[PDB]
C-alpha cells in the first residue's frame, strides 16, 4: 500500500487558473475498502470539496484517487496541503503532503526539430522538442498545429532530469502525418513554466522541410 | 515483501566489449535477519562462472541483495537460459527468475542527431540531442564519439525507453558540448547499440554545430 501526492500542473495553475492536486494511493491488498482520503491545510484553513475516484486495475488491485481544487493564490503564496490515508487493515496512520517547490527560478530554453525521411516511411515524420535549463522541474509541454492544441495522447514527454548544471530538461516526441504538414507545415512546441515569460509560456516553431 | 528481478546484458557489453553480465536483484522490505541465498544455473546444465554479490542496507530499513554473473558471449547469443534461484530459511517458497535472448519481434533503431542553435547569452555552449526510435526489444546502449573516441558515460544522459505509437520504443540522449570541442572538430557521433541492428548491432549518426 503506497500513497503519492502531486503538485498542480503549470498549465492548470497559470493558463487555466484552476489548479488541483491529486492524492493517489496504490493498494496491494484490496478487501472491504472503506479507505478514506482526508484533506487538510497546514494553516488550518478550509479545503474545498474534493473528488474521490476509484478504478479497479487489471492486476487484481484497487487504485483510489482524490482530487482537490486549490486556490491559485493560495498555492503560489506557499500553502501546504495534506492528504491522510486511513485503512482498516493497516495500523491506521499514513500521511502525504505537498507545497510549491522552493529555490531559484530559471526560464526554459525551447528547441524544436524535425526528423528527415526514413526509408519506407514517406508519409510521416517525428518532431522532437528539447526544453532545458529551467527550475524548478515542474513544467507543462504542449503541441500546436494551426494554433489548435493537439490532443495530449499524440505526444509523450520525458520526466524531468537534471542537466550538468542546476536546471532540468525534458524531451517531447510528436509523430505527425503528411496530411498535416501539407495542410500547414508548421508545428509549435510550447512549454508552460512559472519562470517562463511572457505569460509563463515559451514556444518554438518547427517545419518539416 | 520479497521481490526479485533478473536483467539481461547491456548491448554494449554483449556486442562491443564482449563481456556480458546478467544481474539478479533481490529486494526485501522486512529483513528477517538471515541469509537470502542466490544460486545461479544454466538450462543446459553447463557450469556458471563465479558471480559477485553485494548486500546493501537501505535508508528505509531494507535489505537489497544483488549478484552479477559473467556470461559467455557466444552462449548468450546462441540462446542459453540463465536462472537465479532465491531462497531464505523462513519464506513461502523459492523464487525462480530466468533470462534469455528474445525470440519475439525485433526491430532496428532509427537514429537522428540534432544540434541546438545558439541561445542568447550562451554562444560558447551547444546541446547535442539524439533521437533513437522504433526499436525492439527495449535493451539499448548509447555512446557519443568525438575524434573517433568514445566520450565518458557521465558526459551524456539518456532517457528511459518509452513506448512509441505503433511499435517499439524510443530514447533521447542529451550531450552538452563546448566551443573548444566543436572548433577543434565539428563532428559528434551518436551511436546506438542494439541486437536487431544490422550487420554489426550498431546504428550511428553524426551531427555538427555548424
Ligand atoms: C497493478 O497495476 C496498476 C496499474 O498499472 C499499478 O498502478 C501503478 O503503480 C505504480 C507503482 O507505484 C504507480 O507509479 C507511481 O505513480 C506516482 C504518481 O505520479 C505518476 O502518476 C501521475 C498520475 O497522473 C497520470 O494519470 C492520470 C490518469 O490515470 C492523468 O489524469 C494524468 O494526467 C497523468 O497522466 C502523473 O501525474 C505523474 O506524472 C506520474 O506519472 C509517482 O509519484 C510514483 O513515482 C515515485 O517514484 C519515482 C521514482 O521511481 C519518483 O520520481 C517519484 O517522485 C515518486 O517518489 C510512481 O511512478 C502508478 O501511478 C500506478 N498507476 C495507477 C493508474 O494506479 C500497480 O502498481 C500494479 N500493482 C503491482 C503490484 O504491480
Ligand atoms: C526501500 O528502499 C529501496 C531502495 O531505494 C527500494 O528498493 C527498490 O525497489 C524497487 C522496486 O522493487 C526497485 O525498482 C526495480 O528495479 C529493477 C531493477 O532495475 C534495473 O534496471 C534498470 C534499467 O535501467 C537500472 O536503471 C537499475 O539500476 C537496475 O539495474 C527494475 O527491473 C524494476 O522494473 C521492473 O519492475 C517494474 C514493477 O516493479 C515494472 O514496472 C518494470 O517495467 C520492470 O519490469 C524496478 O524498477 C529498485 O531497484 C530498488 N532499489 C534498489 C537500490 O535496489 C525499496 O522498494 C524500498 N521499499 C519500499 C517498501 O518502498
Curated annotation (Swiss-Prot), chain A:
Organism: Homo sapiens (Human)
Glycan-carrying positions: 36, 48, 59
Domain Ig-like residue range list: 1-102, 108-207
Parent sequence residues shown: 217 to 425 of 546
The protein's name: Immunoglobulin heavy constant epsilon
Gene: IGHE
Described function: Constant region of immunoglobulin heavy chains. Immunoglobulins, also known as antibodies, are membrane-bound or secreted glycoproteins produced by B lymphocytes. In the recognition phase of humoral immunity, the membrane-bound immunoglobulins serve as receptors which, upon binding of a specific antigen, trigger the clonal expansion and differentiation of B lymphocytes into immunoglobulins-secreting plasma cells. Secreted immunoglobulins mediate the effector phase of humoral immunity, which results in the elimination of bound antigens.
Disulfide bonds: 23-83, 129-189
Species classification: Eukaryota, Metazoa, Chordata, Craniata, Vertebrata
Superkingdom, natural source: Eukaryota
Subunit architecture: The basic structural unit of both sIgE and mIgE molecules consists of two identical heavy chains and two identical light chains; disulfide-linked. N-terminal variable regions of the heavy and light chains form the antigen binding sites, whereas the C-terminal constant regions of the heavy chains interact with immune receptors to mediate effector functions.
